[PDB]
Structures are given as C-alpha cells and as structure tokens.
C-alpha cells in the first residue's frame, strides 16, 4: 500500500528487508531463549554448553526450536528464477 | 518435424511479413533460430502441449517456453539440456488415476 | 522528440536554423529534403522517471500461472472480481514495493495501481 | 558544492561509546558525549 | 548536515528533473508561455541580449526538494554556470 | 572531455576473425540497407516509443558517412584479421564473412541475408531492452543457460 | 530623501521598481510616492552592493518579483504603508523571511518532515 517510508541513508527496499529482517532475528532469539529456561538441569545440551567445551546456546535453539533465516552473501535467499526462489511459490512473494 | 507442424498452422515465416505487426506478435524461436512470429500465443502453446504430451509428432524432452511478458515462444530440441519428470495437474487435480 | 525520416531516401531528418527566417527545418542530409518543424523541441530527456509502468505492462500476463490471483479489487471496465497483482521489478523505479493489478478476464485489458 | 570523490555522507550519532566523546568532567570523571559524527565513502582529508 | 551538504559532491545532476533543447529564436518571445513572464523581467533589464541572442535555448528544470535539501540558490548555479564558461553562457534564472 | 559525451554511448559490434570492433548500422548496411527506417524496423518494432528511439541517434549519426553497401564491405575488409591485397578482395572478404562467420545458425546461404539481419536487430533489440531496465540481465550461472 | 543619479542603469532599476509599485493600486490605498520609495530602495540596493555586477541586477530582480507577485499582496502593502521601512526592505534574505505566511508554513514544514527524511542509523 505504499505506507512504508524508508529509513534515511536507506531505500525503500532496504528499509522492508531490514524490517523483515529484524522480525524474524528477534522471533528465533525469542524462541531459542524460551527453548533454554525450558531445558531441565539434566539435559545434557545444557550440561555441555554451560561447561563451554563444545556447542552454544544458538546450537541449542536450532535443534530445539527453529533453525532460523538462512542467508546467503549476508542476505535472503534472492530470485534465481523470474522474480521466485523456486518454482512452488507465485512470483514477487516476499514471505519468510 | 517442429517446423513443419508450425508452418501446417497459422505462423508467418520472417521473410514474408511486414516488420509492422512484429511488435503485436509472439516471435518464435526454434534452438534459438527465429522461424516466425505468431498472432495468437496461447492457442499455440496449447496445441503444442497436447501434441508432446500426446507424442504424435513432437517427442518428449522438447522444451516450450512461453516468456508471456516478452511475448516469446523458444523451443527448444538440441542436446544436453537437463529435465526430470513431473506429474500433469489440470483444474488443480491430478491426471494420475 | 524528433523522430522524422526523409520521404525520399527514408533517413533521418536532421534539424537545421533557417536564419532567413528564424525557423526549425528538419533537412535530410546527403538527400536535401527540408520538412517544416513544429515541434520545437529538438531533444528532450528525463532524469527523474518520466516514465509509468502501466504503459509497459501486457495484458497477455493474465494468462500466468505463476502469478498471484486475488479477488479483492474487482475491474473498472467490467466489474470482474478477480484480477492478477504484481510488482514491476524493473529499473528507473528502485522500489516495485507498489503493486500494478490486471483484469482476470478476457478481453478487458485494463489495468491499475494502488 | 561539496568535495570531488565523495558520495553520499552518513550523519549520525555513535552508541558505541568509542566514537562517542570522552571528556573529563570537573570532577574527574569521564563523560562520553553523544555527538554528530560524517561518514563519508570517499577520501580527500586535506580538503576535509 | 549544513557541514554535509558542503561535503557530499552535489553536481548538477543531483538537483535537476529533466532538461530540454529548444529553438526559440526570438528571445523575447517564448515557446513556453510560463517562461514569458518571468523571461520579461530579465529582459526589461537585457544585458548582452540588446536585440539579439543566439537563436537555440537550453530550458533546465532544477529539483525544488534537492536545492532545499542541498541549500543551493539559484545564484549559485548561475555563477558556476558563467564562471565555468565566462561570458560564453548567458543564464537567465526563474525567481526562487 | 571534448565531444565524447555530446555523442554519448554508441553500440558496436565485434565478429570473429576481425581484430576490431565495428558500428552496428554500418553491419546492417553491409547487409544491403540503406534506409534507416529499414534498419531500425529490424531494430525498433513500434516506432512510437520514442526512449528507444534516442537510444540509437548515436550509432545512426556515427555511421553517416557510409550509405552504401560496398563501402561497408571496404570498410570491414579494412579492419579484417587477414587484410585483404585491394578493395575489392576487401569486399570479398568482408562478404564471405558475413555471409559464413557471423550468425552461421541463422544460416549460411545468401538468401538467409534478410534472417540474420533480422536476428541481429532482435540482439540490438534485446540490448536495448537492457539498456532501458524494462528486461533483468541473464545470470551466467542461471541454468537454463547451460549445456 | 533619495539621492538622484544619472546614471541610466540606476534611473532604469528605479523607475521599473516603480511600475512594480504601481501593481495593485495600493499605492492609491495607501497615498505614498512610490517612485521615491523605488529611488530609496535602489539607493540601498547600491550602497548595499556598491557596484552594477551580476548582484545587483539579480538582487533588484529578485525584489521586483517578489513586489510584483499577487500571492503576497500583504508584503506590498507593509512596505507601501511604511510599516517596513526601505532600508530593511533593500536587505531581505531571500524568501526566507521576505514571504507570504503559507509558503513560510510549508517551507518549515518541509523543514521538520526533511528531519524524518534523514535522521538514521537504524
Ligand atoms: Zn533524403
Ligand atoms: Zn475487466
């Protein structure tokens, strides 16, 4: 609808994907983080990440809850195809 | 056999055409050579897909592309292009039985 | 714009001042034809998008499997309900976030934007 | 106007409290401003 | 950002919309009517245009938003203009 | 710097076995046309669009001194990978080039002429098309594009 | 209390710094000698200036239009009634202040929407 006004030193495309963009980071850190005050001190996850010898907390939320927004160059995954990312979606689809 | 079938329909072939009506007709390619230009595109790509998929006279693993945006029909018959088999849905059913 | 060819050698007419006069002359060289000017301007360019999508798109696109349908914005030339909604996606915009929407129905070409 | 070899300029204020500027108050103390700060994406720093 | 606008290269580009080459061979007269009246003004006043002019014309639109954002005037311009070509260039600026 | 700019782009065109690049509408001269209008035809599809128009006024104005098919043929022969000994075996040469190492696809009789000029304005066509951004630039690694 | 010149330039700025006067009839309204007010402001103009280069011919342009134009009738009327004395009027700064109230409200404005327009750093 054309209501969205950009960030300044930002275009109009850039200020849409880095709302999308904040959305789902803050979604996933939400998720992993009540994904971690779920974990019972016996969970062998938490035993190894807590003593630091392997793993962390972000490998825990991926297996546990979401594995997150792939990226790719630093960016969403872009059109290789005509306006899609692959030929099971309608064009110009912007959805996570 | 591609560019037989199509001058059998109604295609005009480059050297017997004014340039005028170019802009208003779908320019077709066959292995990237222009053949012609057609006044009706999706009555040919209709006609073209039941013929392959009926295999009367074009064989399977001929490509037709219709760029509906550009207004071009590429068909496509040489080698080494890559393709997979994929199940044939109409009226958002399937042909499978 | 001066997109004028010669009648006689069909290249193109050039513009010239006719300084006994004070008037443009399109005048094709190497064939010296003269046509009378009127337009005035001899070249115009745009540097801030003086150009709109909606003389771009093709009807033809209702046809698309690929693109989306939504019914929600029926036709101003027939009333049909659905139509096909798109973004341009091309240059001289930098931001297709708008949407073009064409008319589901054969025969009725017509388009919009939101 | 504006100096060859540069492009558009960034203006903003640093979170970071390294670019921020650090001044010692009259007690002694160190206060980090929050102040305007350009960011170019090109160098000419004589003309600057 | 008045120190910005000193930095930041602003060419010509920048802050106009669109630019068109006409013939106009009578000065005092105009193929544009909207130009007259103002056109008038500098020509109550001719300098270097006493009865005559070189019979062509440049008409350049100047981007309203970007001489705001870039706090240029129109005598600005009109002195790099003629500074750049000395008396080459008579330019002849709308009122701000 | 001097005129460079007033001219702007200008579109060439490189064939094989020629050590140098030559302007497009002197290759469709060299293919029998004079009038321009029969050459943007091959080009321009609709002549009312007129961004496209001036999109070719640069290579038109530099190719004006040429009208004539032969003095094409010269001037192509003179810029040949193999120079001819004179003139006409210039010509020639451009000739058999044109006819054979450019577009072979389209075909390689004297016929296909009107073929592969039309092929070659559907390219400048396409160029233009993304000079303008009204068609994406085709990805290399696309593909579709691959054999 | 104009000092007179002979020189055509100045003469010339002057009595076309009348005919904008003139426009509106305010002068009739108001009853005060336009052509001296023009031969004050052209004198300040100078002094201002001390020259006839490119800023003083722009700079009495620049006030003729802005005399002449009927969005801004109040200005003329101010200047002719004496409520802005001619000296002050030699040297206004452009459109900044030297303007209809409308243009001065859309001109701040914009001022505060170009504040939203480059702020940043997310
Ligand atoms: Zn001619
Ligand atoms: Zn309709």
Same mark, same amino acid.
């Given at each position: 609808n054309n209501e969205l006004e950009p960030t300044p030193g930002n275009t109009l495309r850039q200020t849409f994907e880095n709302q999308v963009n904040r959305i789902l980071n803050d979604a996933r850190d939400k998720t992993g983080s009540s994904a971690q005050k779920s974990l019972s001190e016996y969970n062998n996850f938490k035993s190894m990440v807590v003593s630091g010898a392997k793993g962390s907390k972000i490998n825990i939320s991926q297996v546990i809850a979401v594995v997150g927004q792939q990226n790719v160059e630093g960016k969403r995954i872009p059109f290789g195809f005509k306006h899609r990312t692959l030929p099971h979606f309608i064009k110009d689809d912007y959805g996570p | 056999?591609?560019?037989?079938?199509?001058?059998?329909?109604?295609?005009?072939?480059?050297?017997?055409? =004014?340039? @005028?009506?170019? %802009? +208003? %007709?779908?320019?077709?390619? *066959?292995?990237? #050579?222009? *053949?012609?230009?057609?006044? &009706?595109?999706?009555?040919?790509?209709?006609?073209? !897909?039941?013929?392959?998929?009926?295999?009367?006279?074009? *064989? =399977?693993? *001929? =490509?037709?592309? !219709?760029?509906?945006?550009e207004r071009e029909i590429r068909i496509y018959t040489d080698a080494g292009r890559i393709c997979r088999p994929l199940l044939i849905v109409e009226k958002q059913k399937l042909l499978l039985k | 714009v001066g997109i004028r060819?010669?009648?006689? #050698?069909?290249?193109?007419?050039?513009?010239?001042?006719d300084k006994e006069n004070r008037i443009l002359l399109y005048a094709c060289r190497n064939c010296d034809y003269q046509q009378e000017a009127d337009n005035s301007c001899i070249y115009v360019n745009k540097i801030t998008h003086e150009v709109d999508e909606l003389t771009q798109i093709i009807a033809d696109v209702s046809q698309d499997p690929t693109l989306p349908r939504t019914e929600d914005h029926p036709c101003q030339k027939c009333g049909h309900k659905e139509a096909v909604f798109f973004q341009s996606h091309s240059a001289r915009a930098e931001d297709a976030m708008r949407l073009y929407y064409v008319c589901t129905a054969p025969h009725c070409g017509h388009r919009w934007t939101e | 106007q504006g100096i060859e070899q540069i492009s558009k300029v960034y203006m903003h204020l640093p979170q970071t409290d390294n670019k921020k500027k650090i001044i010692i108050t009259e007690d002694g103390e160190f206060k980090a401003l929050q102040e305007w700060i350009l960011e170019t994406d090109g160098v000419s720093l004589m003309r600057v | 950002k008045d120190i910005l606008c000193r930095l930041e290269h602003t060419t010509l580009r920048k802050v106009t919309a669109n630019t068109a080459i006409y013939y106009d061979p009578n000065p005092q007269s105009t193929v544009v009517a909207e130009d007259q009246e103002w056109v008038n003004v500098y020509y109550e006043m001719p300098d270097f245009d006493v009865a005559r002019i070189s019979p062509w014309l440049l008409r350049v639109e100047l981007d309203?938003?970007?001489?705001? &954002?870039?706090?240029?005037?129109?005598?600005?311009?009109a002195e790099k203009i003629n500074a750049g070509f000395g008396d080459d260039l008579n330019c002849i600026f709308n009122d701000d | 710097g001097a005129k460079k700019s007033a001219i702007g782009q200008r579109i060439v065109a490189t064939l094989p076995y020629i050590k140098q690049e030559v302007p497009i509408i002197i290759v469709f001269r060299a293919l029998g046309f004079v009038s321009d209008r029969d050459i943007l035809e091959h080009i321009i599809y609709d002549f009312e669009d007129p961004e496209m128009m001036e999109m070719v006024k640069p290579s038109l104005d530099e190719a004006f001194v040429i009208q004539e098919q032969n003095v094409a043929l010269n001037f192509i022969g003179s810029r040949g990978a193999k120079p001819g000994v004179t003139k006409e075996k210039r010509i020639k040469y451009a000739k058999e080039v044109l006819q054979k190492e450019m577009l072979p696809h389209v075909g390689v009789s004297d016929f296909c002429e009107t073929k592969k000029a039309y092929f070659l304005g559907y390219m400048v066509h396409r160029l233009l098309l993304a000079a303008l951004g009204r068609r994406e630039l085709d990805d290399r690694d696309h593909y579709g594009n691959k054999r | 209390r104009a000092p007179s010149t002979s020189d055509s330039v100045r003469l010339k700025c002057r009595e076309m710094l009348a005919a904008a006067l003139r426009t509106g +009839? &305010?002068?009739? %309204?108001?009853? @005060?000698?336009?052509?001296?007010?023009?031969?004050?402001?052209?004198? @300040?103009?100078?002094?201002?200036?001390?020259?006839? +280069?490119?800023?003083?011919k722009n700079r009495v342009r620049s006030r003729i239009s802005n005399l002449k134009d009927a969005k801004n009738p109040n200005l003329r009327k101010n200047v002719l009634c004496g409520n802005i004395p001619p000296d002050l009027f030699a040297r206004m700064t452009a459109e900044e202040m030297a303007s209809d109230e409308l243009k001065e409200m859309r001109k701040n404005l914009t001022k505060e929407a170009i504040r939203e327009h480059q702020m940043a750093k997310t």
């Open positions: - | 056999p591609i560019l037989e079938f199509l001058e059998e329909w109604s295609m005009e072939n480059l050297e017997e055409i =004014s340039p @005028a009506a170019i %802009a +208003d %007709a779908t320019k077709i390619f *066959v292995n990237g #050579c222009w *053949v012609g230009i057609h006044k &009706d595109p999706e009555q040919l790509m209709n006609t073209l !897909r039941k013929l392959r998929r009926q295999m009367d006279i074009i *064989v =399977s693993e *001929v =490509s037709m592309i !219709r760029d509906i945006r | 060819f010669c009648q006689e #050698c069909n290249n193109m007419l050039y513009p010239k001042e | - | 309203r938003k970007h001489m705001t &954002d870039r706090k240029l005037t129109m005598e600005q311009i | - | +009839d &305010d002068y009739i %309204a108001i009853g @005060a000698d336009e052509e001296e007010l023009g031969s004050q402001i052209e004198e @300040a103009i100078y002094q201002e200036i001390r020259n006839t +280069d490119m800023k003083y």
